[PDB]
């Protein structure tokens, strides 16, 4: 897997990801807010292709993510993130992928997700989130 | 809202 | 150091 | 003056300013750190020329500012920032510009300056600083 | 316009909704 | 259940909780640090007795929690926190309770847990954590 | 003098200080907010007495300090804090003390003073402030 | 790290 680390920004304007219902999450790229202007993050791509792209365009700054959840499971011998859901204060986006395996969830009562880091090989192996006020 | 906040000190200089 | 820090939670997935 | 606001970043790599000892600070521009990379801030220029340029290139991230000080005073009828000094954990840069009028100083015991905002006409009218851990 | 109460990040809840 | 909210502090010195190996977590209490002094949190008690107490005494400030994990699930037809495990930089405490139901985990790469809030009825119904640098 | 350090809290409810119009600032004590309840800070007293006491009772949480200013200078051969003024979003309190020597000022555009540290001998020798969101 | 939360601190103003 290639490690990635976007670092921290001011907020999130858009999430671009891709998935395959045969397998798991493939690619991941965020358009951040940086001091009220868009900042297009690096595009973190799988080693393989064939995934279905999705674009989550948030109504920034009024709309923001309150919970990220998903499932981890084994795909072809790799334990990876198979599904993601993004719940905002407005709507739920997802699940994307295959909702099968071990669940995880990060609900936020106060604060914002301001950045992502993680590792992508064939699929999204794992990820972390920067949180700020 | 969706915008992260930071401490700001100042201003020094003119009103 | 000169690098600002922030809370990081995770990883999830493995 | 024309207001500017660079916003907040991860740190400071270089400060470019100009000054005239007969008057005050003129231009102001910062190269920030943004998650490990240089971010070239917009150049906030005086409406006039005739200033001496200064570039303060810090050994980021080993070197960081621990105190900003200066003087405000009247120049041609306007209260402006006449002088600036930047002390780091390695060295002191300045004073730049005339060290006369009302002193001010912001020593930092813990934390970092991560952004600037202010206003520049003929001279730097005023400024503020974003601080973070 | 801030109030005079300092804010902190809070994650959760886990458990009953 | 009865809600509780300890607020936010400087760090964690000790956690005193009770649990039953057939049901879930019961009582919960924390000794925080507050600017170098122990702050004895209120003891948040189950409505029922019969739990086993455990005292997790951390070597503050060099020892701190890196991950809280556990399970949520049905007891007596209520969704409750059935188990908790606290992993620090020095060792793992738990699991306490019953490791059955839906797993959750909050691993921390950077930052500190500085406060707990939640609700306890017969069992710990839910909880959240204040995080800070 | 005797160094003091209150550390950091949730906000400020009241400042008690004392001063003499011929010398400098004497005593200093803050009633902080800690998670929505008062927390009575330590009373940092001068080694001498006879100062005039001042109580600044803020309308917490809506009234908060936006600028602390004052003057440093010489009293009996020691550099001390001769004067303090506290400006809130609603009112100004001060100056207290003697307004001569070198001025200083901390205006805050965003964030809060949540704690004080410093040193007091016969008079307030120096002080620093904790800032948070 | 350590287990102690930190905060921005500005100052000191005065002696020393
Ligand atoms: O008397 N002048 O040559 C003179 C004329 C116009 C000037 O512009 C003035 O710059 C000022 C100081 O930076 C303020 O920004 C003021 O708002 C701006 O109009 C400043 C000086
Ligand atoms: O009594 C019960 O205990 C339950 C499980 O802990 C819930 O707290 C419920 O609200 C309470 O009435
Ligand atoms: O005026 N005096 O005789 C006089 C006597 C003792 C004094 O004590 C002095 O207070 C100073 C200012 O607060 C410093 O804290 C110094 O450390 C302390 O010894 C200061 C002045």
Short mmCIF file of N, CA and C in Angstrom, two decimals, chain D residues 102-106 109 117 127-128 131, chain G residues 102-106 109 117 127-128 131:
data_model
loop_
_atom_site.label_atom_id
_atom_site.label_comp_id
_atom_site.label_asym_id
_atom_site.label_seq_id
_atom_site.Cartn_x
_atom_site.Cartn_y
_atom_site.Cartn_z
N UNK D 102 4.98 54.05 19.78
CA UNK D 102 4.38 53.18 20.82
C UNK D 102 4.84 51.73 20.60
N UNK D 103 5.66 51.16 21.51
CA UNK D 103 6.05 49.75 21.33
C UNK D 103 4.87 48.79 21.55
N UNK D 104 4.96 47.62 20.90
CA UNK D 104 4.09 46.48 21.25
C UNK D 104 4.97 45.23 21.13
N UNK D 105 4.54 44.15 21.76
CA UNK D 105 5.30 42.90 21.69
C UNK D 105 4.41 41.71 22.06
N UNK D 106 4.62 40.62 21.32
CA UNK D 106 3.92 39.38 21.56
C UNK D 106 4.97 38.33 21.69
N UNK D 109 5.19 31.84 24.75
CA UNK D 109 5.77 30.82 25.58
C UNK D 109 5.50 29.43 25.08
N UNK D 117 -2.91 38.53 9.10
CA UNK D 117 -3.95 39.31 8.43
C UNK D 117 -3.67 40.76 8.79
N UNK D 127 -1.91 44.82 11.87
CA UNK D 127 -1.92 43.40 11.57
C UNK D 127 -2.37 42.61 12.80
N UNK D 128 -2.72 41.36 12.51
CA UNK D 128 -2.97 40.38 13.55
C UNK D 128 -2.35 39.07 13.18
N UNK D 131 -2.71 32.07 15.94
CA UNK D 131 -1.83 31.25 16.77
C UNK D 131 -2.44 29.88 16.94
N UNK G 102 6.79 51.45 30.03
CA UNK G 102 6.69 50.92 28.69
C UNK G 102 5.32 50.26 28.53
N UNK G 103 4.54 50.67 27.52
CA UNK G 103 3.20 50.03 27.42
C UNK G 103 3.29 48.66 26.80
N UNK G 104 2.28 47.83 27.08
CA UNK G 104 2.12 46.58 26.37
C UNK G 104 0.65 46.37 26.19
N UNK G 105 0.31 45.54 25.19
CA UNK G 105 -1.10 45.24 25.03
C UNK G 105 -1.33 43.94 24.26
N UNK G 106 -2.26 43.14 24.77
CA UNK G 106 -2.72 41.92 24.09
C UNK G 106 -4.16 42.02 23.72
N UNK G 109 -8.66 38.92 18.81
CA UNK G 109 -9.76 38.92 17.82
C UNK G 109 -10.58 37.68 17.87
N UNK G 117 -0.32 32.99 34.50
CA UNK G 117 0.87 32.59 35.29
C UNK G 117 1.72 33.84 35.36
N UNK G 127 3.84 38.57 33.93
CA UNK G 127 2.74 37.59 33.79
C UNK G 127 2.56 37.17 32.34
N UNK G 128 1.96 36.01 32.21
CA UNK G 128 1.63 35.40 30.89
C UNK G 128 0.19 34.91 30.93
N UNK G 131 -4.27 30.94 26.23
CA UNK G 131 -5.33 31.29 25.26
C UNK G 131 -5.84 30.01 24.67
#
